[PDB]
From a paper:
Recently, it was reported that a closely related enzyme called Prim–PolC, operonically associated with ligase C (LigC), is specifically involved in LigC-dependent repair of short DNA-gapped intermediates produced during excision-repair processing of lesions in mycobacteria, further expanding the repertoire of pathways in which these diverse replicases operate. A notable feature of Prim–PolC is its favourable activity on short DNA gaps of 1–3 nucleotides, which it preferentially fills in with ribonucleotides.
To determine the structure of a pre-catalytic ternary complex of the enzyme bound to the DNA, a non-hydrolysable incoming UTP ribonucleotide (UpNHpp) and manganese ions were also included. Binding of Prim–PolC to DNA induces a major splaying of the template strand by 97.3°. The templating strand sits on Loop 3 and N321 interdigitates into the upstream duplex region, flipping out a guanine base (T/G-2) from the templating strand, and causes it to adopt an extra-helical conformation. N321 appears to act as a molecular locating pin that stops the upstream duplex from slipping back and forth. Residues in Loop 2 contact and support the incoming primer strand, which is docked into the active site of the enzyme, positioning the incoming 3′-OH within the attacking distance of the ribonucleotide analogue (UpNHpp) and metal ions, thus forming a pre-turnover ternary complex.
Residue numbers in the entry: 4 to 336
Amino acid sequence: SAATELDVDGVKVRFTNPDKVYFPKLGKNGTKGKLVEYYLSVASGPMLALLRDRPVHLQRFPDGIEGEEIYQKRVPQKHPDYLETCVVTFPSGRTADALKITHPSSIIWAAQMGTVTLHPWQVRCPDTEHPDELRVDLDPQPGTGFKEARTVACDVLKPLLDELGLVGYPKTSGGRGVHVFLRIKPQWDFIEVRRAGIALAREVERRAPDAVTTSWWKEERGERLFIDYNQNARDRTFASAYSVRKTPIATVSMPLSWDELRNADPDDYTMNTVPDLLAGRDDPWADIDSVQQSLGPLLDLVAADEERGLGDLPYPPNYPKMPGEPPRVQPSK
DNA sequence: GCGAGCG
DNA sequence: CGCTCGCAACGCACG
DNA sequence: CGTGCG
Ligand SMILES: O=c1ccn([C@@H]2O[C@H](COP(=O)(O)NP(=O)(O)OP(=O)(O)O)[C@@H](O)[C@H]2O)c(=O)[nH]1
Ligand SMILES: C[As](C)(=O)[O-]
Ligand SMILES: [Mn+2]
Ligand SMILES: [Mn+2]
């Protein structure tokens, strides 16, 4: 019952416990072996190209999703020769040797370690100080769901990006909301990219004020879709495209076209369904890397909000007080 | 899930 | 030699 | 101290 060895594109990867249940609800389809089988099916394809050279955090469940959840940002000092690491710097100044996705064996090793979900930073190593991706995180609040997420993405955010001359790429998160990624030239730092995300989010909110909120404070959000602008800060990740999530049916964060997203149901994309869905279908994100976009149009939105008196917004807990950050508390008591 | 180190 | 146990994220601002 | 928030 000893370990076995997988051959992943020339690299030998150790593999154990194929029949350990990770997702109790799926029967024969919820074992660690089924997870590794999924990742072998996607790890050599667009998942890899989307993750290439990014530092990632691991969300591991060595005892399955009902056991303890272990987030992990550091790779152990002692690790297999084929693994590559990269130094990322947190807002405090502390650092971490994070996994760098360079090869499908990186993804397979992560899955052998119990990783259900990979969580990339928005940078490419070794240029870890300049995001190449601006990321929009759409979060339905209680009383809203995926339908609101997809409606706002398709009917407010998409036409707005069109107006601004920008191209965005959507995916299901695998939870109840939506992610939209914009590829940018790595010319700006985390502060500038987060401000550009704030101005984009504020414009979406102005155009759909009954449906959309940017309030960090839960009290002021209402039954609206929250655009989580702090996900563009340093030391903030997104679940990767094609990652499985810790939901009971093992949903997958699924890249879609705008046309597909209009009618999507995230429960259709599972570690059990996704490989068959990918076959006979063109990659909707095939072109994400063909244009490295400028942040200019969004930075002009920033300047125009400044003209109307709107500046920076609060950061999350555990961040140092940032330059220009307003009081990190809910307002007007 | 792994590995240092203890009985 | 066989086993247990520690360990595997980020850690401040505000009243 | 409790509470903020992914
Ligand atoms: O505790 C956490 C929560 C979230 N995150 C990271 O922040 C991202 C967004 O946090 P999120 O709660 O919005 N989750 P998401 O994957 O967007 O699903 P959903 O909002 O239900 O549709 C996640 O995808 C993780 O990468 C963490 O790193 N730690
Ligand atoms: C985004 As989660 C892993 O706290 O459901
Ligand atoms: Mn989200
Ligand atoms: Mn969020």
